[PDB]
């Protein structure tokens, strides 16, 4: 079995929610990581 | 669900204006505020928020419906400005705001009272939401509603284990940044991308079983911006559903992202734009039909880090008289 790599070195999406209802308690993206 | 398709229509408006740039907000937290707006408003300019909230289909009571998570909210109100009981009583019932009186022309001291009240309510995360140029003799009320939280992973990262790597940019140029690292039991999903033709999403929970945080990343001959459009409520649930408990390889930036919007625009594209003129309706918060919404303002801060994550958003509402 080979895992999956998620290998986030490039720009992305992201989401912070509840697991539950659902809600999204923050959304956004990140095009620049750095400081 | 309203606020699904909340998000995402605030979202887009954000991409639309925000060029290539980071984006940071809290949908919860906008629509908190805006649920104390409504309580407010009447007639035409009432009709209009509840339209473009999505709440034509009350919404009062789900909003009631509300590791570390905090929410607040709190009211300040011109001294000897009298607002209607039932504003009041209806602002306790389902937003537990606290009321406070203050003088609006004491400009400097109200805008440092409301920032302390922000720093308090988001372990000092958001700073100057408000300053002395926000305040004066026609200032009536500001509503702010604060959104915090603090979790660790469920299974953290070792800082042993992070190592710089570089992070290619949608415009191909490159940065060297601190790459955390694990393998770890996340949920994970492959979704075509609607051209290898996959993109991935990864959902890792926090502590305590609550909360999660979702990543959605392109493959990486792709912008992300091909996959934006995709984005819709429909299709969110879908990744929720869709995601399974497995083994992952997970290489994840430790990170911060901070963002001010200008609320205002974000609104009046949802087609909220009754409010901000000299005629608004705001006689459900009282008899001066004077008030209106002068401003509005949303500012967020996410830290990642090996640990977990620390948030906060605060959204903030000044109503003056003409």
Same mark, same amino acid.
């Given at each position: ?6 290998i986030?070195?490039?720009?992305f ?6 697991? $539950? ?9 990140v &095009?620049?990581?750095?400081? | ?8 229509? &605030? ?5 639309? @204006? ?15 505020? &805006? ?5 407010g408003?009447?007639?035409? @300019?009432?009709? /209009?928020? $509840?339209?473009?909230?999505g709440?034509?289909?009350? +919404?009062?009571?789900?909003?009631? =419906? ?12 011109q ?9 009041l009583?209806?602002?306790?019932? #389902? ?6 009186h ?10 440092? #009272? ?18 002395? $140029? ?25 800082? +042993? ?12 140029? /490159?940065?060297? !940044?601190?790459? &955390?690292?694990?393998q770890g ?24 079983? /609550? !909360?999660?945080?979702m ?22 649930? +879908?990744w ?10 997970? #290489?994840?930036? $430790? ?5 001010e919007?200008?609320?205002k ?12 003129i ?6 459900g918060?009282?008899?001066?039909k004077?008030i ?10 996410? +830290?990642?880090?090996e =640990?977990?994550? /620390? ?6 509402m ?5």
């Amino acid at each position: 079995v080979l895992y999956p790599q998620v290998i986030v070195d490039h720009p992305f999406f992201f989401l912070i929610r509840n697991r $539950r209802t659902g809600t999204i308690l923050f959304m956004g993206r990140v &095009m620049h990581p750095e400081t | 669900e309203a606020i699904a398709d909340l998000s995402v229509n &605030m979202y887009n408006r954000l991409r639309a @204006t925000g060029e290539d740039e980071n984006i940071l907000f809290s949908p919860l937290s906008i629509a908190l505020a &805006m649920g104390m707006m409504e309580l407010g408003a009447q007639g035409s @300019t009432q009709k /209009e928020i $509840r339209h473009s909230m999505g709440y034509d289909s009350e +919404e009062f009571s789900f909003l009631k =419906e509300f590791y570390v998570m905090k929410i607040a909210n709190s009211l300040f109100v011109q001294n000897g400005f009298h607002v209607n009981e039932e504003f009041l009583q209806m602002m306790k019932k #389902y937003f537990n705001a606290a009321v406070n009186h203050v003088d609006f022309s004491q400009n400097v001291a109200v805008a440092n #009272y409301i920032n302390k009240w922000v720093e308090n309510n988001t372990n000092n995360l958001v700073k100057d939401l408000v300053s002395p $140029r926000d305040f004066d003799a026609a200032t009536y009320l500001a509503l702010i509603n604060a959104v915090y939280f603090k979790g660790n992973w469920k299974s953290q990262f070792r800082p +042993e284990n992070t190592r710089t790597f570089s992070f290619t940019k949608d415009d191909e140029s /490159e940065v060297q !940044i601190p790459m &955390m690292y694990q393998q770890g039991e996340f949920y994970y999903g492959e979704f075509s991308d609607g051209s290898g033709g996959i993109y991935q999403v990864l959902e890792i929970p926090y502590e305590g079983d /609550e !909360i999660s945080m979702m990543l959605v990343l392109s493959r990486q001959e792709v912008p992300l911006a091909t996959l934006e459009p995709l984005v819709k409520a429909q299709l969110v649930e +879908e990744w929720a559903n869709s995601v399974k408990k497995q083994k992952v390889e997970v #290489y994840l930036p $430790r990170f911060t992202v901070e963002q001010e919007i200008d609320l205002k625009d974000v609104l009046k594209a949802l087609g909220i734009t009754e409010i901000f003129i000299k005629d608004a309706n705001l006689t459900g918060l009282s008899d001066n039909k004077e008030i209106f919404l002068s401003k509005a303002i949303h500012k967020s801060f996410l +830290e990642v880090n090996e =640990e977990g994550s /620390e948030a906060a958003a605060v959204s903030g509402m000044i109503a003056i008289s003409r």
